[PDB]
Design a protein around this ligand. Sequence first.
Ligand SMILES: COc1cc(-c2cncc(-c3ccc(C4CCN(C)CC4)cc3)c2C)cc(OC)c1OC
Ligand SMILES: COc1cc(-c2cncc(-c3ccc(C4CCN(C)CC4)cc3)c2C)cc(OC)c1OC
Ligand SMILES: COc1cc(-c2cncc(-c3ccc(C4CCN(C)CC4)cc3)c2C)cc(OC)c1OC
Length: 284
Amino acid sequence: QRTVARDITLLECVGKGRYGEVWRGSWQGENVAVKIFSSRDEKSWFRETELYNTVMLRHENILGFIASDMTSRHSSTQLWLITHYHEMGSLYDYLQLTTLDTVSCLRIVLSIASGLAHLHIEIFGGKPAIAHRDLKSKNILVKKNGQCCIADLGLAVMHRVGTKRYMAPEVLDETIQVDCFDSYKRVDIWAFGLVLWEVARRMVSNGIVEDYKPPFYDVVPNDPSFEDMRKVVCVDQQRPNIPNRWFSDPTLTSLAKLMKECWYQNPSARLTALRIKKTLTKID
Ligand SMILES: COc1cc(-c2cncc(-c3ccc(C4CCN(C)CC4)cc3)c2C)cc(OC)c1OC
Ligand SMILES: COc1cc(-c2cncc(-c3ccc(C4CCN(C)CC4)cc3)c2C)cc(OC)c1OC
Ligand SMILES: COc1cc(-c2cncc(-c3ccc(C4CCN(C)CC4)cc3)c2C)cc(OC)c1OC
């Protein structure tokens, strides 16, 4: 009746970490990305699979799902997540290789806000509301058309802990209202503000740009502890630096105000993803 072509040729490893690997693969002449999970992070494969079994997300700023595969091995289970392949790689990667102009900076950040608002929104008749819980520049991919897409729904919640450097104050001080779905959207907005800061630094104005740095590069070590981050974010209430040169540029002046309104200590004071999108459409 029909041939079901399931062979994927794994061609090159494009990412490796504690808890698995991503490969560029080929299926029927087409590039795909294959994430192979460590057994120690099996729950991330299960959570992303359970979410996509609930709602087949389809959005230009969400990494495109193709398949979840479980294969029996003699004394283990092999878990693969197969998605669209973005040859430009992660935003984290990209910001070290390039500087940005005004149009390219705004296009990047509005595309991220668009993907995030799509996750956050409940649609009736539709999708549940979804919070990401690990938003960061390594979890955003750059597309050839200059927009980005959000990746990794292994920690997502529908209505493992997040990367410590990007944790909101209420996560670090353990006050977060864990029974309130809105709490998790507000944690994503905090992380979005940090990403917005990372990108804005690489936008040129008046011949000036900042070097790529991660959030809090100047106040915490590499692989910062929970306590390192709690002291910076909660006890001292530090926030990333806004350089003086941004205040000569109307785009970076507006982006500075936006990122401040993602970083309030009080989670309910933070902007929503939809309000961030509106603000970004009125900049320039
Ligand atoms: C199982 O595993 C994998 C399968 C595939 C794949 C390969 N050819 C064809 C298919 C296909 C799709 C859809 C239908 C429909 C046709 C309409 N009818 C009313 C209902 C059924 C049939 C067949 C698939 C899904 C790719 C894979 O990798 C990319 C797979 O491994 C993850
Ligand atoms: C998983 O991913 C890929 C899958 C395929 C693919 C292979 N065979 C068959 C299909 C298919 C055919 C027909 C229906 C039906 C559904 C109900 N009704 C009857 C109208 C249409 C659904 C599915 C697909 C989608 C191609 C892909 O790329 C070209 C995939 O992407 C990697
Ligand atoms: C974050 O999370 C996921 C990401 C991806 C993913 C999708 N497209 C492309 C990539 C990629 C390709 C190429 C490079 C680099 C390497 C070599 N060179 C120096 C520059 C280019 C980097 C990254 C990835 C990693 C897939 C995933 O799942 C299948 C992910 O997990 C959900």
